[PDB]
């Protein structure tokens, strides 16, 4: 299936009493794998299958790198607030990562945000930075003048990031590569007088990716469908739903991990 590795950084200027100035977390698929912040100043595993397969020297090495990345984030945020002539508390965020999809093709991404809005987006295929406004355009110019750094990021996204992801996927295979099929049920109920609601509800499934839709007479999709969010149930599995109002033959169609399911409403 499709797997992903990504690392986030968050910087906050002038934080309130309990908010770290810097936080960095890594994920494989929906699973946190690592954490670091300016309070602990220590990189720590967040998944047992990461802790069990990476020796202390690894955590020590990346702790040192994160302490540098924290300092660099602090300075970059100070410079961004200056460009915007902003005071008070503002945020800076980074996301880097890659995906390995089913057909063996890969994606890679690297992006920055200021105050929670897109700021700079790297396109590894053209080796350029897309900027949202003139302040970002200023930073883009500097970064695009360093040809070698652009090439380095392309190599990291396309080769290194994928190799690390495959390594972690093997470490966590009993978790990340398992399948728990959904339990699916259809409920009908008259609500407002003369208005029948149909709910198709799924829970207990892993991975979280699931397709749910309503069809009419087998061929056509129903017009106004309401979709529930895919929500963690807290035990490692997820839940979701889709609903319609009935007015001739309706069915809920569910696809999860290569298995299709149909629930006809009698």
């Amino acid at each position: 299936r499709t797997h992903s590795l990504r690392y986030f950084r968050l910087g906050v200027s002038d934080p309130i009493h309990g908010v770290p100035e810097f936080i960095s977390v890594g994920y494989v698929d929906s699973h946190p794998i690592t954490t670091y912040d300016s309070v602990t100043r220590q990189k720590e595993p967040r998944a047992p299958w990461m802790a069990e397969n990476l020796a202390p020297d690894h955590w020590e090495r990346y702790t040192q790198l994160l302490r540098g990345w924290q300092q660099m984030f602090k300075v970059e945020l100070k410079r961004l607030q200056r460009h915007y002539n902003h005071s008070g508390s503002h945020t800076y965020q980074r996301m880097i990562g890659c995906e390995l999809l089913e057909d063996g093709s890969t994606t890679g991404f690297l992006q920055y945000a200021y105050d929670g809005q897109d700021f700079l987006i790297f396109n590894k295929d053209t080796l350029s930075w897309l900027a949202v406004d003139n302040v970002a355009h200023t930073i883009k110019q500097a970064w695009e003048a360093n040809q070698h750094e652009l090439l380095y990021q392309k190599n990291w996204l396309e080769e290194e990031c994928i190799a690390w992801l495959k390594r972690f996927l093997e470490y966590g295979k009993d978790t990340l590569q398992r399948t728990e099929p959904p339990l699916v049920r259809v409920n009908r109920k008259e609500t407002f007088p003369g208005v029948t609601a149909l709910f198709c509800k799924a829970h207990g499934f892993y991975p979280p990716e699931i397709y749910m839709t309503w069809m009419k007479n087998g061929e056509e999709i129903v017009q106004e469908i309401d979709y529930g969010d895919i929500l963690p149930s807290g035990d490692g599995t997820y839940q979701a739903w889709a609903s319609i109002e009935l007015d001739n033959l309706y069915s809920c169609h569910v696809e999860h991990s290569g298995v299709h399911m149909v629930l006809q409403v009698p």
Partner: antibody
Amino acid sequence: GQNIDQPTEMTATEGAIVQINCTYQTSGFNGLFWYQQHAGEAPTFLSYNVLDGLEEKGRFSSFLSRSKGYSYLLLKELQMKDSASYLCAVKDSNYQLIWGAGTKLIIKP
Amino acid sequence: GVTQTPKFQVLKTGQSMTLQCAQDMNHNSMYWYRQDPGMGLRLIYYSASEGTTDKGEVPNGYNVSRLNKREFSLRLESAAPSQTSVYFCASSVWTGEGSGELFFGEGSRLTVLE
């Protein structure tokens, strides 16, 4: 373990070319550097490669093949002043530099 | 760019010694290497950023202080003959990610004698 190999010494003739090879065996790869170090002096940065191809800087060019795991430093129109040691360094998957033991280049006038 | 002292020093076994390094390039990462015949540079200690340091490959017999953003001192607590070497301090804009190169000091030649 990880290894980076370059010849101990090379000898070539004034006016000619020389190709100094650097092969590396690492779990991952984040770039290859060449440094020049004249005897009794400090190393100075010459070149960096991280994708495949040949990058020219005057009389010096540096080549990388990621799939073959090697690089070379090419010196054209050799001069006596090119006599020096040439150091290769690879940044591994944890961004640490592994250093080759250096290649002393001797030029025959 | 990178200033290290002293260029030459003779020490007696067991003596204490501090090598100084300063860089006026606003770099965040600094490094202490030893260079010995027949082998690649070996990292002794490094400092990814102001306020942190960590061992390299050959830390035993040494320690360091990242005094401030500019300065990275290398101490020999009790000099041993095997610490006869050429010592190089270096800095880079950042460490870890990136294509950034090292900038090297002129080198310190230390000879330790009984």
